[PDB]
Amino acid sequence: DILNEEAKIVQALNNQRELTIKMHELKREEKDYAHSYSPLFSDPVPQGGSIGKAPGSSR
Amino acid sequence: PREAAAHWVPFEDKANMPDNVPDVVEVGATSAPLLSASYFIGAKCKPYNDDFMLCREESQGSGAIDCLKEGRRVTRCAVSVIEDINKSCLDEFRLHWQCLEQNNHQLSGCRKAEALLNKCVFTKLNLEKKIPGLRPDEEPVFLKKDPWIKPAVDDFKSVRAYAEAKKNGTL
């Protein structure tokens, strides 16, 4: 009745250890442009500066 | 797309169009005639001009080298319109751009020879001025009577020609 109450605590600490390893791997995971920056306007693509614009500028 | 320098040095190149681009009949009209004939070469050669700017769009960066075929054809049809307006209405065309060579080439100053030219070209060459993008219940500005903006001096020959067109009844 005491070896079991230790197995409970050691499971409760190994769970916290795996919780840390996860949440330390979830930081270094690379992130989308829609989560990291502006959620709508999800493209990085400009079309910047359209008043005297020339056809053939897109690529 | 850029304004010139401290000390810009002009140069030309005595060279030739190399092998595969044929010879073309380029517009030899100055600012006053092609500013005068702008709506008519815009009315006839709409899809060729549209096609050239579309082809320049689709080949992004290829651009200049890509649509040699097709800026060949906008020049030909613009030259066609201005040869036709020469042989059609050389006198009244000439009246309009001899007007428009004064007044800073402001279009505002020459309504009088303009409407005469527009009758002549709509009769013989059946092309018409339109200002597009203009929703209805908005009068186009070269049709209105008593405008606010009147020129300094109405030029003399168009006063005379417009009065004689009134007397003949062709206007």
Cα separation, B117 vs B125, whole angstroms: 11
Among A47, A51, A53, A58, which would you mutate to test the B interface (most chain B Cβ atoms within 10 Å of its Cβ)? Answer: A58
Q: Which of B129, B121, B98, B116 is nearest to B33 (CA)?
A: B98
Size of interface A-B (CB pairs under 8 A): 18
Token representation of residue A25: 């791997």
Total domain count, chain B: 1
With CA atoms as reference, report the closest residue to B82 among B47, B116, B35, B46: B35
Q: How far apart are CA B51 and CA B58, in angstroms?
A: 10
CB-based contact A59 B54, cutoff 8 Å: no
Closest of B96, B67, B80 to residue B158, by C-alpha = B96
Q: Give the CA dihedral B114, B120, B121, B125, nearest 10 degrees.
A: 180
Alpha carbon distance B29, B35 (integer Å): 9
Q: Which residues of B touch A59 (CB under 8 A)?
A: 60-61
The resolution, in angstroms to one decimal, equals 3.3
d(CA B81, CA B155): 27
User: For residue B61, what are the CA distances in angstroms to A44, A48, A56?
Assistant: 20, 17, 6
For residues A39 and B104, what is the distance between their CA atoms, to the nearest angstrom? 51
Chain A residue at shortest CA distance from B1: A52
Residue holding tokens 């681009």? B21
Q: Alpha-carbon distance B65 to B32, whole Å?
A: 30
Length of chain B in terms of residues written: 171
Domain that holds residue B115: 1-171
Note every long-range contact of B80-85, with CB atoms under 8 Å and residues 24 or more positions apart, other chains counting: B80/B44, B81/B37, B81/B40, B81/B41, B81/B44, B81/B45, B81/B127, B82/B27, B82/B29, B82/B33, B82/B34, B82/B37, B82/B41, B84/B125, B85/B37, B85/B40, B85/B121, B85/B125
- Give the integer Cα–Cα distance in Å for B123 and A38: 59
